Design a protein around this ligand. Structure first.
Ligand SMILES: *C(=O)[C@@H]1[C@H](NS(=O)(=O)O)CCN1C(=O)N[C@H]1CCCNCC1
Ligand SMILES: [Cl-]
Length: 362
């Protein structure tokens, strides 16, 4: 019983102090190790009705959704419906004559379009015309392809245009094609009524209840609600794309290609990669507020780099009431998911993950 005992002891030791310190009501861990899933569930999905977290509890994953968006784009790309060097306006006539004539799909996907902001301004509602108008009027702060500024409207437009290239709405493609191709039956953009009992409550300041509301390009940027078990299934698809039908294998591979570096981080479609091993402090810095909020000059690669082998691929994501983190090591067939119903600092999420990964190495 030693191995099961040791894994429980390790995950408990990593998770419990961080949950206490960040007053996290409920937290789900899922780990893929040596080809088997392992689940560890903590606390409450809802403090008020006493629903406990399980591996089936649905959490908002926020920007981790971008890795799903990237997978749909990978499908469009490897199906020859778009190319990364296409100008954005090729895929939406509304953008012809705008600055998007001079901005590539790759620029949008990797946040280098020239200063698209972190979020849509509050003045832009979930409305196709308002979104249209927003992009039509937007002007770059600096040359496209030169600086990374992490941005929902940037990758949101990338996903929206990938959907246009496939001739169907983004949301429909996700529900009808992407999630089924990945074997995901507990993963939603719009949680069905019959599944609402599984949907955790989110918690903010003074423990106010917070579930995510509608916003422009929400599906593309931050729309996914999923369970720890389903998100680990997605990690396993990423660890083994060859286990999927060829078109989807290629779609996943397209999210494992790096285009430039900023500091220790290599930017793919959705996924962000680090050499492994690397220090906890460096991994935290790559997932820090200044990394997200400030423009960084890029070091472009001479050719796309395979994000595999001795690397850690990760993504953080948050909503007002939730905080998610996913990390995997391709060359070790190892992955983990940490989902919580409080938006707690990225550094703390990474701290839990690092403690688990370090302990599995020891
Ligand atoms: C993604 O989660 C982005 C950003 N990602 S990061 O943690 O990698 O920097 C953190 C917040 N964020 C959002 O998408 N925020 C949305 C949260 C939903 C409520 N308003 C829309 C903004
Ligand atoms: Cl936004």
């Amino acid at each position: 019983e030693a191995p099961a005992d040791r894994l429980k002891a390790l995950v408990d030791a990593a998770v419990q102090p961080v949950m206490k310190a960040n007053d996290i009501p409920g937290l789900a861990v899922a780990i893929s190790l040596k080809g088997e899933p392992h689940y560890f569930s903590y606390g409450l999905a809802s403090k008020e009705d006493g629903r406990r977290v399980t591996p089936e509890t649905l959490f908002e994953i926020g920007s981790v959704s971008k890795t799903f968006t990237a997978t749909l784009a990978g499908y469009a790309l490897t199906q020859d419906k778009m190319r990364l060097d296409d100008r954005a306006s090729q895929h939406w006539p509304a953008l012809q004559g705008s600055r998007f004539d001079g901005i590539s799909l790759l620029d949008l996907a990797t946040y280098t379009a020239g200063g698209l902001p972190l979020q849509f301004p509050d003045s832009v509602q979930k409305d196709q015309a308002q979104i249209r108008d927003y992009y039509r009027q937007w002007q770059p702060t600096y040359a496209p392809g030169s600086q990374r500024l992490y941005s929902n409207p940037s990758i949101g437009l990338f996903g929206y245009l990938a959907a246009r290239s496939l001739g169907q709405p983004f949301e429909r493609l996700m529900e009808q094609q992407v999630f089924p191709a990945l074997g995901l039956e507990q993963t939603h953009l719009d949680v069905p009524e019959a599944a609402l009992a599984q949907y955790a409550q989110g918690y903010g300041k003074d423990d106010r209840p917070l579930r995510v509301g509608p916003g422009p390009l929400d599906a593309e940027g931050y729309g996914v609600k999923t369970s720890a078990a389903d998100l680990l299934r997605f990690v396993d698809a990423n660890l083994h794309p060859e286990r999927l039908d060829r078109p989807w294998a290629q779609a996943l591979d397209a999210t494992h290609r790096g285009y430039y570096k900023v500091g220790d981080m290599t930017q793919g479609l959705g996924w962000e990669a680090y050499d492994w091993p690397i220090s906890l402090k460096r991994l935290q810095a790559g997932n820090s507020t200044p990394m997200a909020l400030q423009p960084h000059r890029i070091a472009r690669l001479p050719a796309p780099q395979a994000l595999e082998g001795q690397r850690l691929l990760n993504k953080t994501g948050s909503t007002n009431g939730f905080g998610a983190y996913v990390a995997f090591v391709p060359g070790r067939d190892l992955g983990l998911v940490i989902l919580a119903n409080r938006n707690y600092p990225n550094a703390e999420r990474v701290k839990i993950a690092y403690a688990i990964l370090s302990g599995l190495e020891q």
